[PDB]
Amino acid sequence: NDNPIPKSVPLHPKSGKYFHNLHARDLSNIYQQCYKQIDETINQLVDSTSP
Amino acid sequence: QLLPYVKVKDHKEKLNIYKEEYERAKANLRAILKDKKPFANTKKTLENQ
């Protein structure tokens, strides 16, 4: 209608390359590093405080 | 002595069909030529996108 801009189009192989390239940013390494940091911080805190 | 009736009728019929085919073809060509520019505009908008 009016300006010929369709709402959506069928996927193309060239579009399929970009669809395959697109991915969620992976935070598994960041989460593992954050978990290791907090765990080591808790371990350090266990004996850090004066008795 | 007069113009050949079979030939004149055949020539008139073929001229009429050729003229109508030419008219529909030119109308379609004008329509597609007019419609082509919005596609160029959409390509420019897509390149901006």
Side-chain angles (χ1 to χ4, degrees):
Chain A
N1 41 14
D2 304 330
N3 189 24
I5 297 292
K7 185 53 188 60
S8 45
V9 290
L11 188 66
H12 283 250
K14 282 80 55 183
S15 301
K17 313 290 183 188
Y18 292 88
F19 182 77
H20 297 347
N21 294 330
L22 254 59
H23 64 288
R25 174 78 273 180
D26 170 71
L27 296 187
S28 62
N29 201 333
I30 303 301
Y31 273 107
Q32 287 177 3
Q33 289 179 5
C34 179
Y35 266 87
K36 186 54 185 58
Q37 184 61 31
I38 190 173
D39 293 337
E40 70 84 6
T41 303
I42 295 176
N43 286 273
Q44 203 285 311
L45 181 75
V46 162
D47 49 357
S48 73
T49 57
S50 180
Chain B
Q1 194 80 350
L2 202 64
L3 299 184
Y5 310 137
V6 279
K7 286 199 287 296
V8 69
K9 285 304 295 181
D10 179 70
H11 286 59
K12 288 323 177 173
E13 288 296 334
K14 72 182 299 181
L15 184 58
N16 282 125
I17 66 181
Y18 289 161
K19 281 195 312 301
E20 66 91 7
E21 284 167 336
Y22 162 81
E23 285 178 0
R24 59 97 185 178
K26 69 184 306 180
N28 181 269
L29 181 61
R30 288 190 311 266
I32 194 57
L33 283 182
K34 289 308 175 294
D35 295 332
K36 266 304 179 299
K37 298 181 304 299
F39 300 125
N41 299 124
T42 56
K43 177 174 301 298
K44 184 256 302 180
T45 61
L46 288 186
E47 91 181 356
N48 293 130
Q49 290 183 187

